[PDB]
Amino acid sequence: GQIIKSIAAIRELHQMCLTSMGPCGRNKIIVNHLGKIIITNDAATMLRELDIVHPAVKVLVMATEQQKIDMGDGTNLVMILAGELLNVSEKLISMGLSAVEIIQGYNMARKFTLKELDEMVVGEITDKNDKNELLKMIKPVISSKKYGSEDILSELVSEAVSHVLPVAQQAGEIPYFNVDSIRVVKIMGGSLSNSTVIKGMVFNREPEGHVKSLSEDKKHKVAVFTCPLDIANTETKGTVLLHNAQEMLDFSKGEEKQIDAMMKEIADMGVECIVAGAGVGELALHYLNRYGILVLKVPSKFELRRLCRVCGATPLPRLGAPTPEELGLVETVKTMEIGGDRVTVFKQEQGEISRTSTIILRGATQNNLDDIERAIDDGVAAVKGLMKPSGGKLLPGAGATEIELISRITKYGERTPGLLQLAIKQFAVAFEVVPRTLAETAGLDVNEVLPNLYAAHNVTEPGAVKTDHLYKGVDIDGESDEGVKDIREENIYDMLATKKFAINVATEAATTVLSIDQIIMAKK
Amino acid sequence: GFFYSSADQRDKLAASERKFVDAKLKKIIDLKNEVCGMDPDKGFVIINQ
């Protein structure tokens, strides 16, 4: 009976994910063996930081990572739903039903569910990319993660998305929004109300020079130099040495006139910013102070990729060749104090629209600072789901989707004759874990809210056309309430691309576990 | 490496690297004009391992 104990091993980790989805969710502190503490609310990220013993657990972990890579949202919906399909299948094992027909029953029920998703679409997203229109998609993403920040972070995330998107409509051929266009930075001090939206990358380091910021001139030229600043010598070896004191005056003054000659030609071309990926010498910073050139050092090669897509600069393998064709152009750059420390940021005005933006976060809490950093990344992939593959269609969330499917699946159960009726009935009951989890973790009584959810989607109407309100979902309460409330008041919806993709992944996840009747292991 | 100290020395030092490149490149671009130049809806692909 190891197939029964295999579900119990997942059941131990099932209750861990039941405390994740919903507003009651909380991050888990994990101390790595290297002395580094990683804290995140996302359950998919935690799976990489946990040591897996039983190999059957990795099956659900691999399916969970698929939800984060493609759609980026719904990782908690895949793991929780896949864990419940094993519990409803455990009763069929004790009943005597073979696991072969159980797998065949899910394949027939999956095709019936996908055909009903097109009829459950309420609204359609016009892809206007307006600041007020993006508030409906971003609100449920921030919801059920961090409480109280949903109102403040709604305007910060929606504003940064509209900056990187150009003006276009009804065109899906050329992609625009990427996953790297939104970067999250953190700084000690401040609050969430004082946070602003930047149209470009934000640098929290020091300029390392006497020039704090450039002027207001239009189209500042920015050059990226991968070669370090130093006198040109032989690429092979070429170490500067002093044999006698006579050559000291020639070598010292030789490097001063050589560097100044290269900086003079760059300043004549109109380049007010020099990006040096490598170290900068001592004599190089002295000449850049009089010419008024901002000093910037970016040793990380990952940040230079998003910089070339904004101003248009190109990295030069050599030094002293300011080719005007490969130079970048930025409208305005300024150095201001944000969060208590003076830093040099990167923004724009009108032309040279940036394809990458960065949101500055401020707060007095260290634990909640890294939690919002991981929460915004989940909202970045939500914009990617607005493309042609069912980006405009949406379904009502807050547990209203799983409850509404109960009436439609049970209607097709008696319609299909044969032994498949056992798997179809258990397939709809497995959706009851979503409303029960939100009601149990919120302190609400099961004998109260749960029977009201069944009566919300099932009523007696003297007519063929549906009426009254089908939008009533699961309410978290927390203060007081009578019955349930309409979800359309808070405008909490779920995209079709996220819900439809989570069904096929969760179906194949539980299919693999039920299909394995034997597991062979060996000690290392 | 080839490091030039003046604009005139840029094409002189780099001429050794582009000597073999320009020899083959100028002969390939002439094939597109002589052959398959007028024919619409066609293309020319180079493998270049």
Curated annotation (Swiss-Prot), chain A:
<keyword id="KW-0547">Nucleotide-binding</keyword>
<keyword id="KW-0832">Ubl conjugation</keyword>
<dbReference type="GO" id="GO:0005524">
    <property type="term" value="F:ATP binding"/>
</dbReference>
<keyword id="KW-1017">Isopeptide bond</keyword>
<dbReference type="Pfam" id="PF00118">
    <property type="entry name" value="Cpn60_TCP1"/>
</dbReference>
<comment type="subunit">
    <text>Heterooligomeric complex of about 850 to 900 kDa that forms two stacked rings, 12 to 16 nm in diameter.</text>
</comment>
<keyword id="KW-0963">Cytoplasm</keyword>
<dbReference type="GO" id="GO:0051082">
    <property type="term" value="F:unfolded protein binding"/>
</dbReference>
<dbReference type="InterPro" id="IPR027409">
    <property type="entry name" value="GroEL-like_apical_dom_sf"/>
</dbReference>
<dbReference type="GO" id="GO:0140662">
    <property type="term" value="F:ATP-dependent protein folding chaperone"/>
</dbReference>
<dbReference type="GO" id="GO:0051086">
    <property type="term" value="P:chaperone mediated protein folding independent of cofactor"/>
</dbReference>
<dbReference type="GO" id="GO:0005832">
    <property type="term" value="C:chaperonin-containing T-complex"/>
</dbReference>
<dbReference type="InterPro" id="IPR027413">
    <property type="entry name" value="GROEL-like_equatorial_sf"/>
</dbReference>
<comment type="similarity">
    <text>Belongs to the TCP-1 chaperonin family.</text>
</comment>
<dbReference type="GO" id="GO:0016887">
    <property type="term" value="F:ATP hydrolysis activity"/>
</dbReference>
<keyword id="KW-0143">Chaperone</keyword>
<dbReference type="InterPro" id="IPR027410">
    <property type="entry name" value="TCP-1-like_intermed_sf"/>
</dbReference>
<dbReference type="InterPro" id="IPR002423">
    <property type="entry name" value="Cpn60/GroEL/TCP-1"/>
</dbReference>
<protein>
    <recommendedName>
        <fullName>T-complex protein 1 subunit theta</fullName>
    </recommendedName>
</protein>
<dbReference type="GO" id="GO:0006457">
    <property type="term" value="P:protein folding"/>
</dbReference>
<dbReference type="GO" id="GO:0005737">
    <property type="term" value="C:cytoplasm"/>
</dbReference>
<keyword id="KW-0067">ATP-binding</keyword>
UniProtKB/Swiss-Prot annotation, chain B:
<protein>
    <recommendedName>
        <fullName>T-complex protein 1 subunit zeta</fullName>
    </recommendedName>
</protein>
<comment type="similarity">
    <text>Belongs to the TCP-1 chaperonin family.</text>
</comment>
<comment type="subunit">
    <text>Heterooligomeric complex of about 850 to 900 kDa that forms two stacked rings, 12 to 16 nm in diameter.</text>
</comment>
<comment type="function">
    <text>Molecular chaperone; assists the folding of proteins upon ATP hydrolysis. Known to play a role, in vitro, in the folding of actin and tubulin. In yeast may play a role in mitotic spindle formation.</text>
</comment>
